[PDB]
Design a protein. Structure first.
Lengths: 689, 124, 310, 147, 14, 49
RNA sequence: CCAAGUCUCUU
RNA sequence: GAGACUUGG
């Protein structure tokens, strides 16, 4: 009984286990998972006050996504007496001088910020691992492959081993992808990437205590009668879209930067034309999947998007192309509304006729979804309904949101109960349909959800992870479930008592989705038992295995200053430096890569490059490296590219273009390098250039 | 008057200047952008029927002549512009220079008939 | 001025302006070394012809016959062009050219024009080195065609600029697009600023630098420059175009008033309230930024006043 | 190779009758240069016998390949030869030649890599592109008629 | 026709 | 490297699991990097490269 | 070659 | 505005 919620018994056990050893906590998501992070921060709060110069130390909170970092920092500030810092690219943190970093760590005892910001910060030697008492990583399951979590983790294998901090991982799911088979190996690679062993509650009393804040939502599968017959307007629309594609193939827009595959194997349709093709293909898929009314909403989405692009056009040719795309979109919308009105002869009551057309002019999936909603929240208090909907594609959220708006303001029983709302990830789409330049609305959708302004939320894999939301009564997974972790986190989002969980699946895929859901059941139970029964006195991986877990990649390089150039960051640093050479708003040009072919590979690399991939980087004309640096023969294109970038950045550092810290030389420092040598007479007047 | 003058008559002026040279015209049409496609549905009726007669007519010598006669019946002067294209057959672009901005292109062999079938799909 | 180049260069050795060097006594500052990797002097002319067809046309249009054509290609190589992997961009060459041309033109006007005051003389130096006049000269001789560049925006600006210049008959003028009162009549008198790309002047200047590096004869280079710029030399010796805004404020009867720039999207304009023959004409300038919009308005006003006074 | 086992015989037979081998063995025989594999559309894609491209631009086009890459049909459309040219001059007038070549250079202000401007016009220079399967199939067709 | 030999140029060459 | 006159070690054992134990002990007791080769990893099919 | 989400840097 | 990462197709 206290305003500062006391540590719960299992929280106490987790804290006093972690304080002695670094490890990973594995619990269903909630305020307890964050609170244990708070308490482990508290328990290591001895050396914050004294300055780093006096051997002081700080704390490092690792979040994945910027908004998650914001929310976690807010929670820490409201739950702790310390003062914390938030660090992303928005705060203009890149230019922060060492004095700013110093007095910052002086004011902020706890440093919170996204992965890559802190990764660059440590690699730039701004702060040292010895300067950090503890490191807390949330959603640590994301730490695999070349994820920045894993890079930061690898950094520990370079500095001295006696000043290494405490590493704590928070997560409600341990696996990332679909590799649910052979769980033990994956769990071991995760525990060995970090420097600890997973921990959880085992005692039945602990089980019951956990259940009070964590609930297992009741779930039922729901399936719709899959129909395939399609209406004539669909084939027509396909025909005009095809004609537009063939015309656009030869639009011959002004020269744009060469676009080629991620593997540098094939060329590409430029971003300008490619974007149009992607938008129309998505619209076609939306129409195919959800029917005609959904298509009517999606076509207005396209209209808004393309009008925005036109207003953002700069080329007469691109202006023309985008206007033409707008015109075709408008034609399609007119035809769709004609088809809608071609059936309104059935009845003139447009209110209920909207419902009826959405039953007729949309696919069975949609019909099932809508009537399930109708029977789910017939006459309930809007404050008492808080449910989520999960859909795959970005534009699906907008389309279904508009469809639900029309449905709500079409049915008497739901007109005054539901308040549909939506939200998607980065590259935010316009939430408005009338293309007006500016709107009064400012409240964000998530804030509406938290405050209760919005009760019905249509999200696509964004609100699933990390984002703190009140327990939701219902969670409708409209799209098929695809990933174990995604399934688990979606299930955990439905946290409240008696919360209902719903899956919408096509009849033909019914048994396959059954297969998947029960493979996931088995994986979850396996994780639970494997944690419960396993016992180990060491409770940390050994040095040999930790060292063996990482060397597979190319070894990092360091200078006498200790600055580390991670090979995974080589491309990022290359593009960073090359972004500064141009001196024109339009002369900006990025590096051009090239892959050597067998015969060229021969006459240069002899017989040493057979059965391996090699990539040559040929930087633009401006800068001085034009020797066509060559990557060492690597197994695959990805590693070959990483090697190419590593070698190129090493050469640049050897040529002094990197200011002994592996960042491009700014004009100020670039000139200071020459100051002493061409400005001797300055220093005698208490004056330096 | 403060908002009627200061923000306002300048809202019109700025958008006007955009349509003059900068923008590809703007939606100053009153209806909702959602309902903007219905612009030609609500187009001036009796002339609508006259254009229906013209389009359904089969006395027109060429699709070029058909397009011009129909489109003047619509009381609109379009501009035929050649868009630089890789096609051997030149690619032409057209404008409807009306508040309901509209632009089409195709190969010269197709452009006129494409106008015809467009307006068939739209004017209905 | 008094002691000429090969002597007063050592003045810097005296003043340590550029640090004295026994290897390079300042007297020898005409020994430019374009070292580094940016240049190669070994490629056969066949590759440049593959990049520069119709060489003879360009040679006779420029008025000087080149010997080592590689200098051309490296000079015409716009940095955005990727497929030239033998030479660098023109930036390092326009860097030296700009100075070379400023010096040569200044020397000519100094030697020949002793009746014109130093203040307008520096104003004229600024105007002649100004990228606007240099770009006009370049287009007048149709050199822009061969520039080897690979970006849409610069090409498009070049296209519209050459169109407008041709509409002006290759005459330097207030670079204004009179959108409305041949301009049509409308409610008010507004216009926009014809934007001058700088890559054009850059490439012309780098070409002259290539001429210098090839011939190593500066009298012949001055011959070329005089042939190219003779009309402007004859003209500006009769009228001195100072900065347009300063031209207005000094002009007795301009008295322009510039309103606050109101912002919509990326566009901003300024209402220029001025008077002409005791009647007030409301003209407006437009631009991406505030200063550009003000300059557009001022140029439009000078345009209007030029038609009114002539 | 009667001694060999069955599997290697099958593998070798697959290689022999595989498309690539047939393509190469017919290419070296110089038949593909005479294939009828493009729909006859005389108005657009065809070269009448007594009519040909200007010799000056022709020689430039064949001699200079890099220049050839980016040549676009509009450049040809820009070469609106006067009657004297097309009838008696053979090569185009120097002014037309110029304007066309600068137009071709300006084409570089469009896509060097992605857009193959030559495809729509290759028939003018006599180049054609054919899928491999067609080449192989012609080889079998010849064999079959001989049989 | 004939350029005036620029006095600076004629001086640095003679 | 071998081509440069380099040399390698060979910890040959009797049984696969005993080889596992010995390789693991070697790994924890030595800074060398060791490779484990038995028929289960498909040692037969590895190519010259 | 396509979908989702995330991050960095920058207008 | 540019790039990258993860996962999947």
């Amino acid at each position: 009984e206290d305003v500062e919620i006391k540590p719960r018994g299992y929280q106490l056990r987790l804290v006093d286990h972690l304080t002695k050893s670094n490890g990973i906590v594995y619990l269903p998501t909630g305020s307890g998972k964050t609170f244990v992070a708070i308490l482990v921060l508290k328990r290591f709060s001895q050396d914050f006050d004294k300055p780093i110069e006096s051997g002081g130390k700080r704390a490092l909170f690792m979040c994945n996504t910027v908004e998650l970092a914001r929310q976690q920092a807010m929670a820490v500030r409201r739950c702790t007496n310390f003062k914390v810092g938030f660090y992303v690219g928005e705060q203009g943190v890149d230019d922060w001088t060492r004095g700013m970093w110093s007095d910052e760590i002086k004011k902020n005892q706890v440093l919170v910020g996204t992965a890559q910001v802190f990764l660059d910060m440590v690699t730039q030697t701004y702060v040292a691992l010895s300067s950090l008492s503890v490191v807390i990583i949330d959603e640590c399951h994301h730490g695999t492959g070349h994820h920045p979590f894993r890079e930061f983790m690898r950094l520990f294998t370079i500095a001295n081993q006696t000043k290494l901090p405490r590493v704590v991982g928070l997560t409600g799911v341990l696996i990332k992808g679909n590799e649910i088979t052979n769980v033990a190996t994956k769990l071991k690679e995760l525990e060995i990437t970090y420097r600890g062993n997973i921990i959880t509650v085992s005692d039945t009393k602990e089980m019951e205590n956990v259940m009070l804040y964590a609930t297992k939502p009741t779930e039922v599968m729901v399936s719709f009668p899959h129909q395939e017959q399609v209406l004539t307007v669909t084939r027509l629309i396909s025909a005009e879209i095809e004609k537009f594609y063939v015309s656009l193939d030869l639009m011959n827009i002004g020269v744009q930067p060469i676009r080629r595959s991620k593997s540098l194997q094939c060329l590409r349709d430029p971003s300008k034309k490619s974007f149009v093709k992607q938008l129309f293909n998505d619209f076609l898929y939306q129409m195919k999947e959800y029917g005609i009314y959904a298509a009517s909403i999606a076509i207005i989405s396209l209209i808004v998007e393309f009008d925005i692009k036109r207003r953002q056009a700069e080329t007469l040719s691109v202006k023309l192309m985008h206007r033409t795309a707008l015109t075709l979109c408008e034609k399609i919308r007119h035809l769709l509304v004609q088809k809608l009105q071609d059936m309104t002869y059935d009845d003139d009551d447009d209110n209920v006729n909207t419902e009826e057309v959405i039953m007729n002019f949309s696919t069975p999936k949609v019909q099932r979804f809508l009537m399930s909603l109708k029977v789910s929240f017939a006459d309930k208090d809007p404050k008492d309904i808080c449910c989520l909907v999960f859909v795959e594609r970005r534009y699906t959220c907008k389309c279904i949101y508009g469809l639900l708006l029309n449905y709500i303001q079409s049915t008497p029983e739901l007109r005054n109960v539901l308040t549909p709302q939506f939200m998607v990830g980065r590259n935010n789409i316009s939430p408005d349909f009338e293309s007006v330049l500016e709107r009064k609305w400012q409240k964000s959708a998530i804030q509406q959800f938290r405050d209760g302004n919005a009760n019905l939320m249509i999200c696509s894999s964004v609100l699933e992870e990390g984002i703190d939301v009140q327990a939701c009564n219902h969670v409708f997974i409209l799209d098929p479930v695809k990933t174990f972790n995604m399934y688990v986190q979606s299930k955990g989002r439905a946290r409240t008592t008696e919360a209902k969980f719903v899956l919408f699946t096509a009849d033909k895929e019914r048994e396959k989705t059954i297969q998947q859901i029960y493979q996931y059941r088995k994986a979850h139970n396996d994780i639970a038992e494997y944690l419960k029964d396993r016992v180990l006195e060491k409770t940390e991986p050994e040095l040999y295995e930790i060292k063996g877990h990482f060397q597979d990649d190319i070894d990092p390089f360091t200078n006498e200053n200790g600055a580390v150039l991670l090979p995974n960051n080589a491309l990022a640093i290359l593009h960073r430096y090359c972004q500064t050479i141009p001196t024109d708003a339009f002369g900006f040009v990025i590096p051009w890569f090239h892959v050597l072919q067998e015969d060229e590979r021969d006459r240069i690399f002899g017989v040493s490059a057979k059965g391996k991939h090699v990539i040559s980087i040929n930087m633009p004309v401006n800068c001085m490296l034009r020797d066509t640096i060559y990557s060492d023969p690597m197994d695959n294109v990805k590693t070959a590219k990483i090697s190419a970038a590593f070698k190129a950045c090493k050469v640049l550092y050897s040529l002094g273009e990197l200011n002994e810290r592996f960042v491009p030389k700014t004009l100020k420092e670039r000139v200071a390098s020459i100051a002493d040598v061409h400005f001797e007479h300055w220093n005698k007047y208490g004056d330096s250039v | 008057e403060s908002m009627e003058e200061l923000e306002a008559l300048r809202r019109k002026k700025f958008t006007t200047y955009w349509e003059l040279k900068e923008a590809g015209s703007v939606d100053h049409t009153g209806m909702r952008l959602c309902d903007r496609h219905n612009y030609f549905k609500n187009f001036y009726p009796t002339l609508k029927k006259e254009a229906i007669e013209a389009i359904n007519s089969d006395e027109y010598e060429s699709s070029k002549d058909k397009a011009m006669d129909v489109m003047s019946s619509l009381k609109i002067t379009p501009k035929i512009s050649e868009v630089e294209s890789s096609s051997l057959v030149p690619l032409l672009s057209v404008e409807l220079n009306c508040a309901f901005d509209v632009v089409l292109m195709a190969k010269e062999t197709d452009i006129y008939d494409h106008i015809i079938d467009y307006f068939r799909t739209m004017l209905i | 001025k008094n002691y000429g180049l090969q002597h007063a260069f050592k003045m810097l050795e005296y003043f340590k302006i550029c640090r004295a060097d026994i290897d390079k006594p300042l007297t020898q500052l005409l020994n430019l070394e374009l070292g580094g990797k940016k240049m190669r002097a070994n490629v056969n002319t066949t590759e440049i012809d593959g990049f520069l067809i119709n060489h003879y046309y360009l040679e006779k249009n420029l008025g000087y016959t080149f010997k080592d054509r590689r200098y051309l290609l490296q000079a015409l190589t716009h940095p955005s062009y990727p497929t030239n992997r033998i030479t660098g961009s023109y930036q390092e060459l326009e860097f030296i050219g700009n100075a070379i041309l400023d010096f040569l033109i200044s020397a000519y006007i100094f030697e020949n024009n002793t009746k014109m005051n130093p203040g307008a003389l520096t104003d004229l130096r600024s105007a002649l080195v100004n990228n606007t006049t240099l770009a006009c000269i370049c287009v007048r001789h149709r050199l822009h065609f061969f520039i080897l560049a690979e970006n849409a925006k610069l090409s498009e600006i070049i296209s519209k600029f050459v169109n407008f210049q041709e509409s002006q008959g290759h005459r330097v003028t207030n670079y204004v697009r009179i959108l409305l009162e041949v301009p049509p009549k409308g409610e008010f008198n507004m216009s926009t600023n014809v934007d001058v790309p700088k890559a054009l002047g850059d490439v012309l200047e780098a070409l002259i630098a290539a001429v210098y590096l090839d011939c190593r004869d500066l009298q012949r280079t001055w011959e070329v420059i005089f042939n190219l710029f003779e009309p402007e030399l004859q003209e500006f010796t009769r009228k001195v175009p100072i900065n347009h805004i300063r031209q207005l404020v000094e002009h007795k009867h301009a008295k322009p008033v510039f309103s606050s720039p109101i912002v919509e999207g990326e566009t901003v304009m300024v209402s220029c309230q001025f008077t002409c023959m005791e009647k007030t004409i409301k003209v407006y300038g437009f631009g991406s930024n505030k200063d550009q919009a003000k300059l557009s308005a001022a140029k439009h006003a000078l345009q209007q006043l030029s038609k009114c006074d002539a | 190779y009667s001694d060999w086992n069955e599997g290697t015989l099958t593998e070798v037979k697959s290689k022999l009758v595989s498309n690539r081998n047939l393509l190469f063995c017919l290419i070296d025989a110089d038949i593909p240069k005479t294939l009828n594999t493009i729909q006859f559309t005389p108005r657009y894609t065809w070269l009448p016998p007594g009519i040909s491209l200007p010799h000056n631009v022709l020689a430039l086009w064949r001699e200079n390949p890099e220049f050839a890459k980016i040549i676009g049909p509009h450049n040809l459309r820009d070469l609106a030869l006067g009657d004297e040219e097309s009838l008696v001059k053979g090569n185009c007038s120097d002014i037309n030649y110029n304007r066309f070549v600068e137009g071709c250079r300006a084409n570089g202000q469009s896509f060097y890599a992605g857009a193959d401007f030559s495809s729509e016009v290759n028939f003018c220079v006599g180049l054609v592109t054919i899928p491999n399967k067609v080449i192989a199939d012609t080889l079998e067709a010849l064999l079959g008629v001989i049989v | 026709g004939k350029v005036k030999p620029l006095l600076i140029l004629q001086k640095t060459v003679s």
